[PDB]
């Protein structure tokens, strides 16, 4: 029990955010018609 040396922080720049949002929305657009059947 002490400060763990393996300490790191995750980062995500704006370009990555846009890529992720676009991927999610495109996948939803592609699969919504199939899921609603």
């Amino acid at each position: 029990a002490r400060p763990n040396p393996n300490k790191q922080v995750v980062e995500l720049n704006r370009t990555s955010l846009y890529w992720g949002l676009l991927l999610i929305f495109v996948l939803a657009v592609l699969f919504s018609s199939y899921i609603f059947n």
Partner: peptide, 30 residues
Amino acid sequence: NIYGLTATALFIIIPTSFLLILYVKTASTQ
């Protein structure tokens, strides 16, 4: 339609919330 609508809503919301949380964590430290 309940199954499909619920699945679509969750898939839209949860990953977007995760990505937004990560980005806001990133953008805080200039």
